[PDB]
Design a protein around this nucleic acid. Sequence first.
DNA 1: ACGTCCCTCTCGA
RNA 2: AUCGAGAGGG
Lengths: 53, 49
Amino acid sequence: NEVFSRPEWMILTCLPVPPPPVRPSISFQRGEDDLTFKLADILKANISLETLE
Amino acid sequence: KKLMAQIFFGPTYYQRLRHMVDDKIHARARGPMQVLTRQPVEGRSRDGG
DNA sequence: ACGTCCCTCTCGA
RNA sequence: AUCGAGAGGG
């Protein structure tokens, strides 16, 4: 499609950061959400690669 | 009055079981609310829908 | 590839 | 509270 689904965008260049309601934290002093931790792992897996290159 | 039908009558052994109605009943109309789905909550325990 | 509906308890990171 | 496993109730 010419605007809603270019193919070129099955390649992710920029990433959507969903907000807290998607991935809240609960008082267990707190404790973030599986999708919160994962994205730090991505932002840790990204940064390392940012500088390597 | 008597009963035109006679009745079979003796001492059969019976047993209480672990289900009391008062342990089972439950009601809810507005109330506690989950946090990711924002919907009601699961069970007589947590008093929900 | 999904694999019947709902409900009441009890317990380990 | 959250997920995971377990026995029963129609």
